[PDB]
Design an enzyme around this catalytic site. Structure first.
Site, PDB file in Angstrom:
ATOM      1  N   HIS A 132       7.505 -34.239   5.303  1.00 25.16           N
ATOM      2  CA  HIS A 132       8.359 -33.946   4.152  1.00 25.16           C
ATOM      3  C   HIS A 132       8.803 -32.490   4.042  1.00 25.16           C
ATOM      4  CE1 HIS A 132       4.619 -33.023   1.617  1.00 25.16           C
ATOM      5  NE2 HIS A 132       5.447 -32.059   1.257  1.00 25.16           N
ATOM      6  N   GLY A 179       3.268 -26.066  -2.611  1.00 28.00           N
ATOM      7  CA  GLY A 179       3.160 -25.150  -1.494  1.00 28.00           C
ATOM      8  C   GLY A 179       1.875 -25.265  -0.705  1.00 28.00           C
ATOM      9  N   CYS A 231       0.666 -28.190   0.446  1.00 23.91           N
ATOM     10  CA  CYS A 231       0.800 -29.251   1.432  1.00 23.91           C
ATOM     11  C   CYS A 231       0.626 -28.670   2.832  1.00 23.91           C
ATOM     12  CB  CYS A 231       2.172 -29.939   1.277  1.00 23.91           C
ATOM     13  SG  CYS A 231       2.465 -30.672  -0.380  1.00 23.91           S
TER      14      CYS A 231
END
Ligand code: CL
Lengths: 305, 305
Positions: A41, A143, A145
């Site tokens: 993503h 942020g 991830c």
């Protein structure tokens, strides 16, 4: 003496964390040898996340659209593929800090350390567990991830978890390092709801063994039970069923303290039915289920790396 | 979202840990530039510890009696002095992994990370606090003496704690890096008893602010109070007195949530008098006092290093 929620030293993993940018989105990646791993993503807008088609979103992107930053210096991307829900970016440099490592898929009840990161920089280390409903109860802002969970065996780091999603519940979901989510979760912003978070019974028993080793002994009782009777009472409190393999795994703790595994279950049964009566066990007022039996052995003996 | 007991990444400190042997005793040391720091009791037998005379024990020893091992390779000791309760061994090599660093003496209520070590090898990382009675509730087996507690500000590691003693209570005591114990403790095996372990009130308030930020809001009440009234009720529960400086320190958390500091005290007052009624706050059933106000700000905003 004493017993603490303890995480592995994070040094081997710090030196693998990079920042990955794809246009407007920035998150963290894991740089192992000449590959950088990160959640797929990275390639989405915030609008794209209600219903993304990843294979179509990826056709727009080229090797140079991914900006990988290792501390100060840029890495050159020479190849990129999608594997399930992770992207693998082929860079020209091997990481000079690559430790010995393995990718492992863990099972519910297992524990691991998370190195929380923002923009490729480590912010903190903590210990958590894969809940039976396949979520983890972490600490993750936007942020973060791409932060990874790992276990260290002497010299070898076993990577087991990459962070990807926060559910509307405030709990978290992610993948192994081959990109497959744990449990039924997907990398879309939709109505995904976690199931019953049951308590990991074998882990609670491990933590009660840690207690008697360390002094807290008031809860030791005069009763015993059987697996079937205990499991009757465990189902009513949303406790994982205790199995004969769990009994075997607790053998070493049983041997060290002279307390048979089934006696400790009967001690646990009474804490579920009668409560704590305001007392504490290792400084908690509720039962802790985020130590595995191997964690207890390790912390109580002095295992290093 | 979510809130966890989080320790600093330990990488900068791992690369400073060595093993120090003086004849029969082995513990850990901190190698910073060309000095190795370690507890002075490395020079004692187990019998020596009931009544040691350290200046006399040290006359027997020479530079070469101290064996310092940095992972595999030996360091050459060229000078040794005693400063209060730490030994400083001058070695010929500067540590190539020395980070920017400072020695700081912290105050009760402050928190820090411990890198637990045995024989110079890191075993784990956890977060703890200097209790008001100047003990810490750690996890320390024999051989862990010399493990250090630290705080990291961006690039600079602030060392604040070295482990030395375990009291018969199962709690722990140690020094700053200039060798002065925290509190009234000494490096002898005698009848030393810790005082009342009071609860760090400002830290509890910080942790309740963390809760409302993260969802748990059931405990928010309809009452307010004053510092004097609250402190009346705090003394009866062995809670540190709340001061006007503590109020100021909590300002930023007050500003972010719209909940005045004194309103949150009145919320805390009712939890002390009425209990938790079986409920939880951030997954605990008792009040947590091992986050400082700065810890909460840092974890809830994404501060990195
Ligand atoms: Cl608790």
């Amino acid at each position: 003496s004493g017993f603490r929620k303890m995480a592995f030293p994070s040094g081997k993993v710090e030196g693998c964390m990079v920042q990955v940018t794809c246009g407007t989105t920035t998150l963290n990646g894991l740089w192992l040898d000449d590959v950088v791993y990160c959640p797929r993503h990275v390639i989405c807008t915030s609008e794209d996340m209600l219903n993304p088609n990843y294979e179509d979103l990826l056709i727009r992107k080229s090797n140079h659209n991914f900006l990988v930053q290792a501390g100060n210096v840029q890495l050159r991307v020479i190849g990129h593929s999608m594997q399930n829900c992770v992207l693998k970016l082929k860079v020209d440099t091997a990481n000079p800090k690559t430790p010995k490592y393995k990718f492992v898929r863990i099972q519910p009840g297992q524990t691991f350390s998370v190195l929380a990161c923002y923009n490729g920089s480590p912010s903190g280390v903590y210990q958590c567990a894969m809940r039976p409903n396949f979520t983890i109860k972490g600490s993750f802002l936007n942020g973060s991830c791409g932060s990874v969970g790992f276990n260290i065996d002497y010299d070898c780091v076993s990577f087991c978890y990459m962070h990807h999603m926060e559910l509307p519940t405030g709990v978290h979901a992610g993948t192994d390092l081959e990109g497959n989510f744990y449990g039924p979760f997907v990398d879309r912003q939709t109505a995904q709801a976690a199931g019953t978070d049951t308590t990991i019974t074998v882990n609670v028993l491990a933590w009660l063994y840690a207690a008697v080793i360390n002094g807290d002994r008031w809860f030791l009782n005069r009763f015993t039970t059987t697996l079937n009777d205990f499991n009757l009472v465990a189902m009513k409190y949303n406790y994982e069923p205790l199995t004969q393999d769990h009994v075997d795994i607790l053998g070493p703790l049983s041997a060290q303290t002279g307390i048979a595994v089934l006696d400790m279950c009967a001690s646990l049964k009474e804490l579920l039915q009668n409560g704590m009566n305001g007392r504490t066990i290792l400084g908690a007022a509720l039962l802790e289920d985020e130590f595995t039996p191997f964690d207890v052995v390790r912390q109580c003996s002095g295992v290093t790396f």
